[PDB]
Amino acid sequence: TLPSLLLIDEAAAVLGRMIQGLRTGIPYIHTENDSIKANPILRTALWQAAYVLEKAYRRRYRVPWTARRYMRELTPRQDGRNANREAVMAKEFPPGAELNSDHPVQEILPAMIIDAEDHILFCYLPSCVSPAIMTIIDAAVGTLATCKMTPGVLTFAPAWWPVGHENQLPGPASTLKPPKGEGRMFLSDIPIASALVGAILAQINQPLFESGVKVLRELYSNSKLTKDHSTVSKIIEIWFSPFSSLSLIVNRATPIHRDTSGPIEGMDILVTGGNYSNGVLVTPSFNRRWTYNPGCVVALLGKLVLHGVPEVDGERYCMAHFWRERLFDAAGVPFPYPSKWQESYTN
Numbered sequence: 630t631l632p633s634l635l636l637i638d639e640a641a642a643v644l645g646r647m648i649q650g651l652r653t654g655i656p657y658i659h660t661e662n663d664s665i666k667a668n669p670i671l672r673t674a675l676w677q678a679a680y681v682l683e684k685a686y687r688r689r690y691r692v693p694w695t696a697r698r699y700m701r702e703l704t705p706r707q708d709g710r711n712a713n714r715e716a717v718m719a720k721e722f723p724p725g726a727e728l729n730s731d732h733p734v735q736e737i738l739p740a741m742i743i744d745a746e747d748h749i750l751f752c753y754l755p756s757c758v759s760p761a762i763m764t765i766i767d768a769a770v771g772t773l774a775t776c777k778m779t780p781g782v783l784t785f786a787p788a789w790w791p792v793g794h795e796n797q798l799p800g801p802a803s804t805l806k807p808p809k810g811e812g813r814m815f816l817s818d819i820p821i822a823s824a825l826v827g828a829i830l831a832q833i834n835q836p837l838f839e840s841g842v843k844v845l846r847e848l849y850s851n852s853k854l855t856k857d858h859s860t861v862s863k864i865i866e867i868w869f870s871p872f873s874s875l876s877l878i879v880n881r882a883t884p885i886h887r888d889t890s891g892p893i894e895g896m897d898i899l900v901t902g903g904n905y906s907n908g909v910l911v912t913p914s915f916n917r918r919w920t921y922n923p924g925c926v927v928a929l930l931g932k933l934v935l936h937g938v939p940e941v942d943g944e945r946y947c948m949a950h951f952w953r954e955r956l957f958d959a960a961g962v963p964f965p966y967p968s969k970w971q972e973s974y975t976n
């Protein structure tokens with residue numbers, strides 16, 4: 630009875646069917662949900678994502694360690710700045726023969742990196758987002774941000790803890806409390822984009838997608854879980870995403886680092902955009918750089934994978950979709966462990 634969740638559910642389903650079709654050569658079944666079917670921009674964006682993701686599953690680098698063991702050496706707040714600690718990790722967890730060809734060339738083709746037991750650590754999807762959707766995001770960010778976009782970070786979530794309120798109940802993000810403010814407006818401008826990124830997540834880690842949606846369901850229906858539940862409810866009704874949170878990072882370069890808030894096993898999804906030509910995402914553990922230009926998507930275990938992105942020759946923003954495990958705890962949903970790549974093929 631919550632149509633936004635039902636739309637991202639169908640977007641996930643129909644994109645999976647598109648991928649299964651590309652793999653089998655049999656016509657895929659269209660969605661009868663005409664929020665998708667009658668929306669040419671979202672529909673063709675799902676086609677494009679299907680091509681890129683199918684390209685990525687066919688191009689898999691393996692590191693010779695597991696995510697479990699890597700996670701075990703990690704100190705609770707090992708964000709990547711201790712260079713000595715990082716060189717010790719790097720010896721204990723080297724790139725391996727499939728990756729550490731001497732000095733690495735920059736990747737441009739879609740690909741993924743899986744651990745020793747087939748878990749997806751990193752998924753690189755260049756040009757995964759159609760120009761039309763990138764233009765929707767360009768407009769939304771534009772009107773929100775007014776060098777030509779004022780730098781900064783801005784965070785949105787229907788259920789959240791502000792810094793200093795950790796031990797109270799969670800509630801609407803301050804940026805989203807004004808019902809006609811900048812925040813809500815921004816969310817209202819981007820449901821097609823949100824729906825796309827959530828569908829991509831389903832293709833990479835279906836259980837995590839449906840856990841997230843389950844959590845949003847429970848936060849909607851169960852009032853005793855949050856402050857200001859009326860505002861929580863209104864925001865969930867325009868929350869076209871399975872993620873706990875969305876963060877817009879405008880005109881900022883990013884040092885090589887690890888996230889340390891968020892579950893050690895959560896997969897974030899970054900979408901980069903703007904008008905610049907020399908984007909590069911750096912992953913030292915994988916001995917790799919990845920071309921990182923507007924419309925690129927990267928999914929990654931970001932509390933595990935060191936990643937950074939240098940200054941570029943233009944305006945740039947990044948949309949970062951991520952997780953708060955405490956919301957899972959509060960909603961009675963265990964947080965799932967990272968999916969294996971074969972799960973993509975279990976039809």
Ligand SMILES: O=C(O)CNC(=O)C(=O)O
Nearest residue numbers: 883888899901938947949
């Ligand atoms: O620079 C970017 O596009 C991505 N940002 C991050 O991973 C982060 O803030 O943790």
Ligand SMILES: [Mn+2]
Nearest residue numbers: 887888931936
């Ligand atoms: Mn990050």
